[PDB]
Amino acid sequence: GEEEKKRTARTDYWLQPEIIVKIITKKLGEKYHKKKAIVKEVIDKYTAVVKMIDSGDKLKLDQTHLETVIPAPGKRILVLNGGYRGNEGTLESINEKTFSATIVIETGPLKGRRVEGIQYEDISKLA
Numbered sequence: 001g002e003e004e005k006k007r008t009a010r011t012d013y014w015l016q017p018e019i020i021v022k023i024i025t026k027k028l029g030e031k032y033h034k035k036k037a038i039v040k041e042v043i044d045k046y047t048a049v050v051k052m053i054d055s056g057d058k059l060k061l062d063q064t065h066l067e068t069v070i071p072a073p074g075k076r077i078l079v080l081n082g083g084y085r086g087n088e089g090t091l092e093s094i095n096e097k098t099f100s101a102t103i104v105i106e107t108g109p110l111k112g113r114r115v116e117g118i119q120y121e122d123i124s125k126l127a
Contacts, residue, residue, distance in 0.1 A: 013045035025065035
């Protein structure tokens with residue numbers, strides 16, 4: 001949004017369970033590279049368990065081995081960072097200019113908050 005924060009780095013950990021991420025590490029194999037997996041469990045916030053959506057395999061990858069993926073408008077997302085982090089949102093529209101998205105909070109008393117400028121790195125495709 002209209003923030004004087006030139007850096008959108010809220011928290012260095014962004015791994016939340018029940019989100020889809022893309023494996024950009026290739027460390028476990030190319031069969032896992034650029035593939036989509038769901039976080040089954042986060043261990044130490046910087047490390048999480050991802051179950052391959054396609055392969056079905058259970059992997060143990062660090063945040064640096066994973067990348068947040070952004071769905072289409074109308075889909076649910078999990079906001080990972082910011083003052084809304086931990087909440088669920090619906091993707092309204094994306095801003096590829098700032099690499100951010102417009103999401104509306106769908107959880108708690110914050111439900112109904114359509115907040116814009118949420119970086120693709122601060123949200124994830126909800127499982």
